[PDB]
Design an enzyme around this catalytic site. Sequence first.
Site, mmCIF file in Angstrom:
data_model
loop_
_atom_site.group_PDB
_atom_site.id
_atom_site.type_symbol
_atom_site.label_atom_id
_atom_site.label_comp_id
_atom_site.label_asym_id
_atom_site.label_seq_id
_atom_site.Cartn_x
_atom_site.Cartn_y
_atom_site.Cartn_z
ATOM 1 N N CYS A 170 7.706 -21.281 -12.801
ATOM 2 C CA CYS A 170 7.762 -22.491 -11.980
ATOM 3 C C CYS A 170 8.168 -22.197 -10.523
ATOM 4 O O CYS A 170 7.598 -22.756 -9.587
ATOM 5 C CB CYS A 170 8.683 -23.549 -12.590
ATOM 6 N N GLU A 173 0.680 -16.627 -7.297
ATOM 7 C CA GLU A 173 1.916 -16.645 -8.085
ATOM 8 C C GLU A 173 2.100 -15.339 -8.859
ATOM 9 O O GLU A 173 3.236 -14.872 -9.018
ATOM 10 C CB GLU A 173 1.895 -17.837 -9.042
ATOM 11 N N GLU A 221 -4.575 -16.067 -4.124
ATOM 12 C CA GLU A 221 -4.835 -16.391 -5.528
ATOM 13 C C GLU A 221 -6.138 -15.728 -6.009
ATOM 14 O O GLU A 221 -6.204 -15.149 -7.078
ATOM 15 C CB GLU A 221 -4.920 -17.914 -5.673
ATOM 16 N N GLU A 273 -2.229 -14.782 -14.483
ATOM 17 C CA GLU A 273 -2.383 -14.379 -15.878
ATOM 18 C C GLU A 273 -1.309 -14.907 -16.826
ATOM 19 O O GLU A 273 -1.426 -14.729 -18.033
ATOM 20 C CB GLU A 273 -2.397 -12.853 -15.972
ATOM 21 N N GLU A 320 3.366 -8.036 -15.711
ATOM 22 C CA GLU A 320 2.589 -6.816 -15.662
ATOM 23 C C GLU A 320 3.084 -6.062 -14.441
ATOM 24 O O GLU A 320 3.930 -6.573 -13.688
ATOM 25 C CB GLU A 320 1.120 -7.170 -15.531
ATOM 26 N N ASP A 367 17.438 -23.193 4.276
ATOM 27 C CA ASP A 367 18.045 -23.986 3.210
ATOM 28 C C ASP A 367 18.496 -25.300 3.820
ATOM 29 O O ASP A 367 19.246 -25.311 4.810
ATOM 30 C CB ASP A 367 19.245 -23.264 2.588
ATOM 31 N N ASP A 411 16.482 -31.164 -12.130
ATOM 32 C CA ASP A 411 16.780 -31.198 -13.569
ATOM 33 C C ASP A 411 15.588 -31.864 -14.286
ATOM 34 O O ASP A 411 15.475 -33.092 -14.296
ATOM 35 C CB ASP A 411 18.070 -31.957 -13.831
ATOM 36 N N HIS A 437 14.498 -32.844 -19.877
ATOM 37 C CA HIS A 437 14.609 -34.143 -20.514
ATOM 38 C C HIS A 437 13.294 -34.506 -21.133
ATOM 39 O O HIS A 437 12.269 -34.308 -20.496
ATOM 40 C CB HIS A 437 14.958 -35.166 -19.451
ATOM 41 N N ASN A 474 3.993 -30.907 -9.503
ATOM 42 C CA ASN A 474 4.429 -30.023 -10.578
ATOM 43 C C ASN A 474 3.399 -28.925 -10.804
ATOM 44 O O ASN A 474 2.369 -28.877 -10.118
ATOM 45 C CB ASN A 474 4.737 -30.887 -11.821
HETATM 46 C C1 LIG Z 1 10.446 -22.382 -14.530
HETATM 47 N N1 LIG Z 1 9.373 -22.257 -15.206
HETATM 48 C C2 LIG Z 1 11.803 -22.042 -15.049
HETATM 49 N N2 LIG Z 1 12.873 -22.472 -14.168
HETATM 50 C C3 LIG Z 1 13.389 -21.663 -13.197
HETATM 51 O O1 LIG Z 1 13.010 -20.496 -13.004
HETATM 52 C C4 LIG Z 1 14.377 -22.397 -12.317
HETATM 53 C C5 LIG Z 1 13.867 -22.326 -10.873
HETATM 54 C C6 LIG Z 1 15.140 -22.193 -10.011
HETATM 55 S S1 LIG Z 1 15.727 -23.873 -9.678
HETATM 56 O O2 LIG Z 1 14.715 -24.486 -8.818
HETATM 57 O O3 LIG Z 1 16.098 -24.526 -10.894
HETATM 58 C C7 LIG Z 1 17.250 -23.671 -8.770
HETATM 59 C C8 LIG Z 1 18.453 -24.004 -9.377
HETATM 60 C C9 LIG Z 1 19.634 -23.853 -8.693
HETATM 61 C C10 LIG Z 1 19.633 -23.359 -7.416
HETATM 62 C C11 LIG Z 1 18.466 -23.024 -6.796
HETATM 63 C C12 LIG Z 1 17.275 -23.187 -7.473
HETATM 64 CL CL1 LIG Z 1 15.869 -22.763 -6.604
HETATM 65 C C13 LIG Z 1 16.077 -21.346 -10.920
HETATM 66 N N3 LIG Z 1 15.713 -21.799 -12.278
HETATM 67 C C14 LIG Z 1 16.502 -21.842 -13.355
HETATM 68 O O4 LIG Z 1 16.072 -22.369 -14.387
HETATM 69 C C15 LIG Z 1 17.882 -21.277 -13.213
HETATM 70 C C16 LIG Z 1 17.895 -19.806 -12.842
HETATM 71 C C17 LIG Z 1 18.769 -19.373 -11.865
HETATM 72 C C18 LIG Z 1 18.822 -18.048 -11.524
HETATM 73 C C19 LIG Z 1 17.997 -17.135 -12.144
HETATM 74 F F1 LIG Z 1 18.074 -15.826 -11.791
HETATM 75 C C20 LIG Z 1 17.122 -17.535 -13.121
HETATM 76 C C21 LIG Z 1 17.088 -18.884 -13.485
HETATM 77 C C22 LIG Z 1 18.942 -21.784 -14.178
HETATM 78 C C23 LIG Z 1 18.973 -22.227 -12.715
HETATM 79 C C24 LIG Z 1 12.009 -20.797 -15.881
HETATM 80 C C25 LIG Z 1 12.061 -22.167 -16.537
#
Ligand SMILES: *C(=N)C1(NC(=O)[C@@H]2C[C@@H](S(=O)(=O)c3ccccc3Cl)CN2C(=O)C2(c3ccc(F)cc3)CC2)CC1
Length: 217
Positions: free
Chosen positions: A25, A50, A86, A92, A96, A114, A137, A140, A184
């Site tokens: 994501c 990506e 892209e 994929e 890799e 930021d 978040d 949900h 999204n």
């Molecule tokens: C996407 N398919 C997934 N979610 C993530 O990789 C998310 C993206 C960021 S974030 O946008 O949630 C975020 C959160 C707090 C502060 C800055 C940002 Cl940009 C990080 N993601 C996470 O799920 C977390 C994370 C944090 C650090 C890390 F190294 C790996 C994951 C838990 C916050 C993978 C489902």
Amino acid sequence: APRSVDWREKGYVTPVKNQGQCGSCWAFSATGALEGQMFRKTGRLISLSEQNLVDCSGPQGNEGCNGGLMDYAFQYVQDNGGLDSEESYPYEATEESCKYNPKYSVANDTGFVDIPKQEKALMKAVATVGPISVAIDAGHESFLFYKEGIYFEPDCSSEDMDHGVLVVGYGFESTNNKYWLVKNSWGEEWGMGGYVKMAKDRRNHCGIASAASYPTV
Ligand SMILES: *C(=N)C1(NC(=O)[C@@H]2C[C@@H](S(=O)(=O)c3ccccc3Cl)CN2C(=O)C2(c3ccc(F)cc3)CC2)CC1
């Protein structure tokens, strides 16, 4: 700021993509923001890779299909001196070896900004810069099964974000009726053609202003 903004109408935004069964994501949020800023700078919209981010931005702190941060992606592009298209480095949905080729680079960045953790600041930024990477978040069932209208989840957190997406604008319904326009990466069969209208100016609902940022170009 204006009362409504929609960068899609100005050509800043690629069509909705689909991350599939890979936790990438953050890579889609980052390519979205960089697509916007490259368009601002050059007038050319080019879809970005990506997979290049997934495979190659480990040194900066990203974790491939396991998760990552948009700012680390922006740092990779700067460190690396480029990012492939892209088309040249297709998606994929698996990890890799890094296959970055500078010959196919179509984007660059000079760092990132930021945004202050307030929705007024996020609105400022969207109104002036273009599309903005945000953390939300999304953990949900109401979000997973979202279809229509302005999304509001009483149990949403403004601190525990778990999904990176892209704010492409904002507006209002009728005439608690404001929304953020959020792209999204779950394909066009989710939500409103792949978009969700997130509640805006409801005390940072789902943390949409808690970790917002964009690449400088
Ligand atoms: C996407 N398919 C997934 N979610 C993530 O990789 C998310 C993206 C960021 S974030 O946008 O949630 C975020 C959160 C707090 C502060 C800055 C940002 Cl940009 C990080 N993601 C996470 O799920 C977390 C994370 C944090 C650090 C890390 F190294 C790996 C994951 C838990 C916050 C993978 C489902």
